[PDB]
């Protein structure tokens, strides 16, 4: 069991086209979070957006019902690609 930052990623609410997600903030400062999301497996490229490190929630929009999605959240840092924590990911079908 690998740790990750952030840790407790879950869908708080779902609609046919949206997923409201949330996670637990770590003890440490995170500058921003990158959220990527894409249809599980192939075939499309993932979409992505970022939210401030002060956030622990986000809304993913423009999805299609009955589709399996893989959602990944990275803890990111200014002026650096030395992101030291494993991202966290979940699967969810609308």
């Amino acid at each position: 069991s690998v740790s990750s930052v952030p840790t407790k990623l879950e869908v708080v609410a779902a609609t046919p086209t949206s997923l409201l997600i949330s996670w637990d903030a770590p003890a440490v400062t995170v500058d921003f979070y990158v959220i990527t999301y894409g249809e599980t497996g192939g075939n499309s490229p993932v979409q992505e957006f970022t939210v401030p490190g002060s956030k622990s929630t986000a809304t993913i929009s423009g999805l299609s019902p009955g589709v399996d999605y893989t959602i990944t959240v990275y803890a990111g840092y200014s002026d650096s690609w030395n992101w030291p924590y494993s991202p966290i990911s979940i699967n969810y079908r609308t």
Partner: protein, 114 residues
């Protein structure tokens, strides 16, 4: 504080001081054979290959032999990092797949993200 530029960053495939985790982000819209080569920020000289295959990223340590040659597989060792990458660009030789498409370089992040 700011990491100096490594001479190897002239290569499209060498992205410099990038963590395993940042590499996964950088490869998230790649295809089979998308890859980058990275060094550790904290203790440089330790380099890795990150390679995309069937929607997953695979990470490989680059080893230094006792005579200074570099290799992923001890059966295929080279004088320079560029030679090693060029080798593995047609011969998997241990890698899940060949190193075919250097990942596009992105602007370094700011507090506002990436």
């Amino acid at each position: 504080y700011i990491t100096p530029v490594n001479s190897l960053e002239k290569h499209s495939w060498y992205h410099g001081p990038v963590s395993r985790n940042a590499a996964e982000y950088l490869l998230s819209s790649g295809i089979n054979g998308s890859f980058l080569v990275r060094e550790s920020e904290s203790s440089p000289g330790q380099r890795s290959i990150s390679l995309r295959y069937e929607g997953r990223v695979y990470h490989y340590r680059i080893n230094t032999a006792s005579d200074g040659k570099l290799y992923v597989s001890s059966e295929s060792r080279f004088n320079t990092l560029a030679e090693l990458v060029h080798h593995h660009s047609t011969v998997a030789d241990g890698l899940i797949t060949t190193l075919h498409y250097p990942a596009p370089k992105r602007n370094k992040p700011t507090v506002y993200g990436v």
